Amino acid sequence: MSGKMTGIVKWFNADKGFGFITPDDGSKDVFVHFSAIQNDGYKSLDEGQKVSFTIESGAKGPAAGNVTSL
């Protein structure tokens, strides 16, 4: 089961729809794909922006889900 957490968008390459978010807890970077973006408009993230999402630690590491602006 994933847990809820906020963080700041570290880098998001719209060209691939892939990016990483740095949790406010200072934990390891969480992988976020455009598919996780529940925000209106084009699915993407703006570096420096605070966001909120759930974190599920898989074999490939922590993955973000249900991502929306904080």
PDB file of C-alpha atoms in Angstrom:
ATOM      1  CA  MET A   1       0.000   0.000   0.000  1.00  0.00           C
ATOM      2  CA  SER A   2       1.248   3.463  -0.956  1.00  0.00           C
ATOM      3  CA  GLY A   3       1.600   6.313   1.534  1.00  0.00           C
ATOM      4  CA  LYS A   4       0.737   9.988   1.088  1.00  0.00           C
ATOM      5  CA  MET A   5       3.555  12.536   0.944  1.00  0.00           C
ATOM      6  CA  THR A   6       4.394  15.975  -0.439  1.00  0.00           C
ATOM      7  CA  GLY A   7       7.581  17.194  -2.116  1.00  0.00           C
ATOM      8  CA  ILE A   8       9.113  19.535  -4.690  1.00  0.00           C
ATOM      9  CA  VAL A   9       9.486  18.744  -8.390  1.00  0.00           C
ATOM     10  CA  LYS A  10      13.203  18.228  -8.998  1.00  0.00           C
ATOM     11  CA  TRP A  11      13.213  17.635 -12.753  1.00  0.00           C
ATOM     12  CA  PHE A  12      10.635  16.627 -15.360  1.00  0.00           C
ATOM     13  CA  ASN A  13      11.424  16.009 -19.027  1.00  0.00           C
ATOM     14  CA  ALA A  14       8.170  16.470 -20.939  1.00  0.00           C
ATOM     15  CA  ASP A  15       9.897  15.028 -24.003  1.00  0.00           C
ATOM     16  CA  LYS A  16       9.774  11.642 -22.278  1.00  0.00           C
ATOM     17  CA  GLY A  17       7.049  12.385 -19.734  1.00  0.00           C
ATOM     18  CA  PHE A  18       9.446  11.231 -17.018  1.00  0.00           C
ATOM     19  CA  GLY A  19      10.799  13.131 -14.016  1.00  0.00           C
ATOM     20  CA  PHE A  20      11.742  12.898 -10.340  1.00  0.00           C
ATOM     21  CA  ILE A  21      10.287  14.556  -7.245  1.00  0.00           C
ATOM     22  CA  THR A  22      12.214  15.259  -4.043  1.00  0.00           C
ATOM     23  CA  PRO A  23      10.110  14.539  -0.961  1.00  0.00           C
ATOM     24  CA  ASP A  24       9.871  17.213   1.731  1.00  0.00           C
ATOM     25  CA  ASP A  25      11.156  14.593   4.168  1.00  0.00           C
ATOM     26  CA  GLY A  26      14.440  14.658   2.257  1.00  0.00           C
ATOM     27  CA  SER A  27      14.115  10.986   1.327  1.00  0.00           C
ATOM     28  CA  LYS A  28      15.316   9.402  -1.914  1.00  0.00           C
ATOM     29  CA  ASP A  29      13.974  10.849  -5.163  1.00  0.00           C
ATOM     30  CA  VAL A  30      10.617   9.465  -6.294  1.00  0.00           C
ATOM     31  CA  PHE A  31      10.106   8.533  -9.944  1.00  0.00           C
ATOM     32  CA  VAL A  32       7.074  10.205 -11.518  1.00  0.00           C
ATOM     33  CA  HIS A  33       5.723   9.592 -15.015  1.00  0.00           C
ATOM     34  CA  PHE A  34       3.270  11.801 -16.903  1.00  0.00           C
ATOM     35  CA  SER A  35       0.661   9.088 -16.362  1.00  0.00           C
ATOM     36  CA  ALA A  36       0.654   9.925 -12.653  1.00  0.00           C
ATOM     37  CA  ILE A  37      -0.178  13.555 -13.412  1.00  0.00           C
ATOM     38  CA  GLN A  38      -3.794  14.207 -12.433  1.00  0.00           C
ATOM     39  CA  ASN A  39      -3.522  17.952 -13.028  1.00  0.00           C
ATOM     40  CA  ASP A  40      -5.576  19.648 -15.741  1.00  0.00           C
ATOM     41  CA  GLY A  41      -4.015  20.394 -19.125  1.00  0.00           C
ATOM     42  CA  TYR A  42      -0.870  18.735 -20.474  1.00  0.00           C
ATOM     43  CA  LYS A  43       0.455  16.056 -18.125  1.00  0.00           C
ATOM     44  CA  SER A  44       3.697  17.545 -16.812  1.00  0.00           C
ATOM     45  CA  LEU A  45       5.447  19.072 -13.803  1.00  0.00           C
ATOM     46  CA  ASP A  46       7.139  22.434 -13.260  1.00  0.00           C
ATOM     47  CA  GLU A  47      10.469  22.194 -11.442  1.00  0.00           C
ATOM     48  CA  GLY A  48      10.393  24.060  -8.131  1.00  0.00           C
ATOM     49  CA  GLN A  49       6.651  23.512  -7.764  1.00  0.00           C
ATOM     50  CA  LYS A  50       5.316  21.861  -4.610  1.00  0.00           C
ATOM     51  CA  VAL A  51       3.172  18.801  -5.310  1.00  0.00           C
ATOM     52  CA  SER A  52       1.321  16.077  -3.414  1.00  0.00           C
ATOM     53  CA  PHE A  53       1.102  12.378  -4.256  1.00  0.00           C
ATOM     54  CA  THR A  54       1.281   8.803  -2.985  1.00  0.00           C
ATOM     55  CA  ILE A  55       4.530   6.827  -2.928  1.00  0.00           C
ATOM     56  CA  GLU A  56       4.780   3.115  -3.703  1.00  0.00           C
ATOM     57  CA  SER A  57       8.183   1.469  -3.296  1.00  0.00           C
ATOM     58  CA  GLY A  58       8.576  -1.111  -6.063  1.00  0.00           C
ATOM     59  CA  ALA A  59      11.479  -3.121  -7.472  1.00  0.00           C
ATOM     60  CA  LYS A  60      12.528  -0.069  -9.483  1.00  0.00           C
ATOM     61  CA  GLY A  61      12.308   2.159  -6.409  1.00  0.00           C
ATOM     62  CA  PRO A  62       9.681   4.609  -5.164  1.00  0.00           C
ATOM     63  CA  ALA A  63       7.070   5.506  -7.777  1.00  0.00           C
ATOM     64  CA  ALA A  64       4.669   8.449  -7.587  1.00  0.00           C
ATOM     65  CA  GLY A  65       0.918   8.113  -8.087  1.00  0.00           C
ATOM     66  CA  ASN A  66      -2.056  10.480  -7.969  1.00  0.00           C
ATOM     67  CA  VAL A  67       0.117  13.552  -8.510  1.00  0.00           C
ATOM     68  CA  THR A  68      -1.496  16.969  -8.096  1.00  0.00           C
ATOM     69  CA  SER A  69      -0.320  20.502  -7.331  1.00  0.00           C
ATOM     70  CA  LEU A  70      -0.010  21.306  -3.629  1.00  0.00           C
TER      71      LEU A  70
END
